[PDB]
């Protein structure tokens, strides 16, 4: 039985002795990487391509560095390469990917996350709200998901005001401050990067909108490492995230290898070949067999959009003690 080679790239010391416990054969290597940045990540991955033939990468980190996904998308698009982003910056949801990319992520799409937030907002009659975003992708997609749900709402959600903040530009004008004062509504929905949420919450603090009578709902793109809340954040915040506490790393790694290997099995069993690696520094047919996937009793299908059809969600509160609290699942 022929095999296929795969690399698992990790930043941060993890489980080794313990995350190990068919119709085609898999071949896994473990590669630690000291750094996360354009240069270093690109370099090590293509170095792995030229020293040995590798057909896919499962990538996980313990950081909030969202650009990892941005970068990995680029890489995938360039080398006909499957890349799984199973944790950390690799799992920060990357919208507007290359139409040719083979980069896929664990976690919920922005569509589903807006959906969950509205499920929540019904739970507390929060039928008045406002939306604040920066220029970060998913922005249009987020607010359009929500506005679409409101047009077909049989309840009059008062989408009072919605704000766009430009974060590629300086705020020596306080134009961000002035925009945020348009917010009077009790509930505010913030979509941006975690870093940007830090700055924007310094601002929303400075104009009293973090004060109570006010409550914020923010997706998983700002929760990040749910263990880290910088000293710049207000409490009583609400977020959604991938339930990384009850779905541990061994489970997602097992999923990561089994996705790729099931795809290899089926494509080779029917078209009689598995594409040969571009060590350079043609069909992505694998995508078909990477969308609809099943293994050892689990639904591992991705949407045609490029995100899990069944992400496991937890609904969390930043509480009395500045720690995220399971409040729903």
């Amino acid at each position: 039985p022929p095999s296929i080679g795969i690399a698992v790239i990790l930043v941060g010391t993890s489980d080794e002795v313990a995350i190990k416990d068919l119709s085609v054969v898999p071949r896994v290597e473990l590669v630690a990487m000291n750094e996360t940045d354009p240069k270093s990540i690109i370099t090590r991955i293509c170095d792995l391509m030229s020293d040995r033939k590798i057909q896919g990468v499962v990538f996980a980190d313990d950081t909030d560095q969202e650009a990892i996904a941005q970068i990995l998308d680029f890489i995938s698009a360039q080398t006909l390469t499957p890349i799984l982003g199973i944790h950390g910056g690799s799992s920060m949801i990357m919208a507007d990917k290359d139409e040719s990319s083979m980069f896929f992520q664990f976690g919920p799409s922005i569509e589903q996350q807006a959906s969950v937030m509205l499920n929540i907002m019904e739970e507390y009659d929060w039928y008045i709200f406002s939306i604040v975003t920066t220029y970060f992708p998913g922005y249009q997609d987020f607010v359009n998901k929500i506005r679409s749900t409101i047009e077909n709402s049989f309840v009059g959600w008062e989408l009072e005001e919605v704000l766009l903040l430009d974060m590629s530009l300086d705020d020596g004008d306080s134009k961000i401050q002035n925009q945020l004062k348009k917010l009077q509504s009790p509930i505010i929905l913030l979509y941006c990067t975690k870093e940007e949420a830090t700055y924007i919450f310094e601002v929303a603090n400075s104009v009293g909108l973090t004060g109570y009578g006010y409550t914020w709902i923010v997706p998983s793109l700002v929760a990040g490492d749910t263990d880290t809340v910088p000293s710049e954040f207000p409490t009583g915040l609400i977020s959604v995230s991938y339930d990384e506490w009850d779905y541990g790393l061994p489970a997602r790694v097992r999923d990561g290898i089994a996705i790729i290997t099931t795809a290899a099995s089926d494509m080779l069993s029917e078209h009689s070949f598995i594409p040969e690696p571009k060590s350079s520094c043609q069909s992505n047919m694998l995508n078909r067999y990477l969308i609809n996937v099943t293994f050892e009793g689990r639904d591992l299908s991705f949407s045609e959009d490029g995100y899990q059809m069944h992400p496991k969600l937890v609904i969390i509160l930043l509480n009395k003690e500045r720690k995220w609290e399971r409040v729903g699942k």
Partner: antibody
Amino acid sequence: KLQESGGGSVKLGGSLKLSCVVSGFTFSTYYMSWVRQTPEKRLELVAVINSNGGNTYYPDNVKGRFTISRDNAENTLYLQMSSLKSEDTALYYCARRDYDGFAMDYWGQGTSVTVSS
Amino acid sequence: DIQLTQSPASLAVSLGQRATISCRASQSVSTSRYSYMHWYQHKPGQPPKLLIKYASNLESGVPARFSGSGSGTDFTLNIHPVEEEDTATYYCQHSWENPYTFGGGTKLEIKR
């Protein structure tokens, strides 16, 4: 380019080996195929083989009945047909490649196999 | 396992006019990112030559007169303008499921 050779007529349940001469490309990188033109002028896929033998595919019509071989050094496409039936009478073609990559890019000229006593 | 219906089975066209063959499949043979078909042609005593590469792709060596179109389950082979050099049977193919198949075939006999 390519040209078939080794055809003829043999009897039921017997065997016959067809092969084809290869010229002008890196033979060890292409995916090779054997197709059937039934004398009723309909085309049918007989067998395909990987870059080097890692997958020998036959439709269940000639599975077991046929077998493909490759010579990656002497650049030869090979197919032995055995335990033959009258059904296997046809014009047989060699075809090849789409480079990652399914379709049949380039075709041979065909040799005639007549199955009868 | 996938079926193929070529239509029409034979036709006659004036020289210089358009000519159209098409084919239907039992299943979707395309993704939302790309599409997977190919066309071939047959003169008498002929090596079958590739005409259309993927779905709407002119082969490196066949004249611009030929062009394909389609997706999902309906695919089309177009010849404009038609030559007598094109007198031929034509075959339709898919490469999705493991049994790659051909159509029943269709004949092009030139109006003369």
